[PDB]
Design a binder for this molecule. Structure first.
Ligand SMILES: Nc1ncnc2c1ncn2[C@@H]1O[C@H](COP(=O)(O)OP(=O)(O)NP(=O)(O)O)[C@@H](O)[C@H]1O
Ligand SMILES: Nc1ncnc2c1ncn2[C@@H]1O[C@H](COP(=O)(O)OP(=O)(O)NP(=O)(O)O)[C@@H](O)[C@H]1O
Ligand SMILES: [Mg+2]
Ligand SMILES: [Mg+2]
Ligand SMILES: [Mg+2]
Ligand SMILES: [Mg+2]
Lengths: 338, 343
């Protein structure tokens, strides 16, 4: 089979390029402005994903600059990057077999819901990844099931796709047309330009709700439809809430408990209500979300995956990761963990 | 079977309540905030559609107020309206069997595309409905295949769903979150608040392109994706063009030759029409009346034009003074010689 050899620069560390050979290339994904392939590294045999995007040589690639700064167990790792050819930038990433999207779809069209233990594991790891990037001022801006990679057997989740990510800086305006439909925060729908990283939290909340319901909680082909669905659940925004973020129906909130199926864990519902809040500043921070009681089972000395394996890394927090509220380490790192 | 009798107010004319009895009610449509039923009138056995929406006791219904002013052969007719019960407003409309959406989906999954003669008829009638509402300053704001009703046998198209419509007043700001995904004008994606009725033209262009392609021309789950698809076709917006849409870090891509965008043997005139509809600069897009006069529709003006099934085409030239008001002279092109024959 065709063997390709390039001189690629390690994602992290010093700019010291090395020769890398790979083979067995096959498209495994796309995107409006991208193509992803899977390939096997010739020496290690490890599988990698290679994201190829047209790059304007005259400028710096933001996705690349952001990924080079990230080192977290819940964020897909950038192994190397290299150019090829119009010039293309190629991001060689760790290969991850699944997405929360594909997995959720399996349960949905099987008429079942993902067991709660997995909802806990996946959401907890997503919030860890968010606490980490937010600590650098980086907002992902495209949190959705398709960007959440999963390894089925280890239950490890890895946030991926930083093509919409950006460091948010007070006073600077940001485009409001980022983020996928169903997962957009209300302020985004209203065209806000001074939004914060809390838009990622709203999205995380939509993912949680969706994993619990078996379908998107705020569907809709237009912004107006999405606003209506949001309003049918949260109730009409008070004027003050709208300001924080109007020809809309005056509707009373729908009992969060009646939104979900009966049997849905109370803690899960409570978490949702603290994520999907109109007022951006009232939503939990990702670190606070990790500490929520819904995740207490993950901190149980005896929890194990359904396949019998131990849970993946969950407590290896760093100072960087806890910076938004250090005292939470008392909750986040159980007595038995190290 | 159950018979429902209600007292309803006429759509237009004197407010003289009518008593209406209908049966065989069944759901035929939905909306995040609505439900449409089909019903059979007891007297004539005619079918009608009834759009039921919750009504703010505290406001007047804009969709209703707008529909009461419309009288056009390419706009679904509001027959009566009445309240029922929380209070609901019920709009009784003429029943139309199909949508451009369903028709297009059938051809698309059958690996076909509808005869261009239908593309001409549907688009022409859509542009007539737009020239008419725009002449009143009314912008639909939700032009998409599902809101284009069709009668398969007569080939008559009727614009429906004025739940997003609004009279655009210069100097006034408007929400940018209206309009379905694939059909949103770029200025809407950029969050413009001072957009005009030309956003309906962009949408009409997306419908045309989609009818020609067999699928949406600018798909995408996020605004960014849509902008990329738009850019892959139109090319990167110039500095000035960005200022026209109003309210940018996208790769510089050159325009894709429109001809290369559509299947082989797509009519040149169709492609040309698209290019004049899907323009970045809002003011550069054709007006709907100008669109009706485009050469792509010349065949509809031919005296011997017939529907494939052999019938005559629907009325196409009964233009009113209101319809032509945006540019009266165009009538020299819009009303063909044979249609001016007194006989
Ligand atoms: N490291 C990886 N391992 C395995 N599959 C991957 C990896 N990275 C991307 N993919 C897959 O390819 C798809 C598209 O990759 P992605 O990075 O998100 O491209 P994109 O163009 O930025 N996408 P988007 O803007 O979300 O439409 C993902 O949803 C995954 O299913
Ligand atoms: N006069 C009619 N005759 C037959 N079917 C109709 C009629 N009006 C509406 N429908 C159907 O019902 C669907 C929904 O009606 P619609 O008026 O658009 O509700 P809506 O809540 O405003 N929809 P939307 O905002 O587009 O999601 C339409 O797309 C048609 O398929
Ligand atoms: Mg993605
Ligand atoms: Mg992306
Ligand atoms: Mg509709
Ligand atoms: Mg509507």
């Amino acid at each position: 089979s065709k063997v390709t050899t390039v001189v690629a620069t390690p994602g992290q560390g010093p700019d010291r390029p090395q020769e890398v050979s790979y083979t067995d290339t096959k498209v495994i994904g796309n995107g409006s402005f991208g193509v992803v392939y899977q390939a096997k590294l010739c020496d290690s045999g490890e599988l990698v994903a290679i994201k190829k995007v047209l790059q304007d040589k005259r400028f710096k690639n933001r996705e690349l600059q952001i990924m080079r700064k990230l080192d977290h167990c819940n964020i897909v790792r950038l192994r190397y990057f290299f150019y090829s050819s119009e010039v293309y930038l190629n991001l060689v990433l760790d290969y991850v077999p699944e997405t929360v999207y594909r997995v959720a779809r399996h349960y949905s069209r099987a008429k079942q819901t993902l067991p709660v233990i997995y909802v806990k594991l996946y959401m907890y790891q997503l919030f860890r990844s968010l606490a980490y990037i937010h600590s650098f001022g980086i907002c992902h801006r495209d949190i959705k099931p398709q960007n959440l990679l999963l390894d089925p057997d280890t239950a490890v989740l890895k946030l991926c796709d930083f093509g919409s990510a950006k460091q948010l800086v007070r006073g600077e305006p940001n485009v409001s047309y980022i983020c996928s439909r169903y997962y957009r925060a209300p302020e985004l729908i209203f065209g806000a330009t001074d939004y914060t990283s809390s838009i990622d939290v709203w999205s995380a909340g939509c993912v949680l709700a969706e994993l619990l319901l078996g379908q998107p909680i705020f569907p809709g082909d237009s912004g107006v439809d999405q606003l209506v669905e949001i309003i049918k659940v949260l109730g009409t925004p008070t004027r003050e809430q709208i300001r924080e973020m109007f020809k809309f129906p005056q509707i009373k909130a729908h009992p969060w408990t009646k939104v979900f199926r009966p049997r849905t864990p109370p803690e899960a519902i409570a978490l949702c209500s603290r994520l999907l809040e109109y007022t951006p500043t009232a939503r939990l921070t990702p670190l606070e979300a990790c500490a929520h009681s819904f995740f207490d089972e993950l901190r149980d000395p005896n929890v194990k995956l359904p396949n019998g394996r131990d849970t993946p890394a969950l407590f290896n927090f760093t100072t960087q990761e806890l910076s938004s509220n250090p005292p939470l380490a008392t909750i986040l790192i159980p007595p038995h963990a190290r």
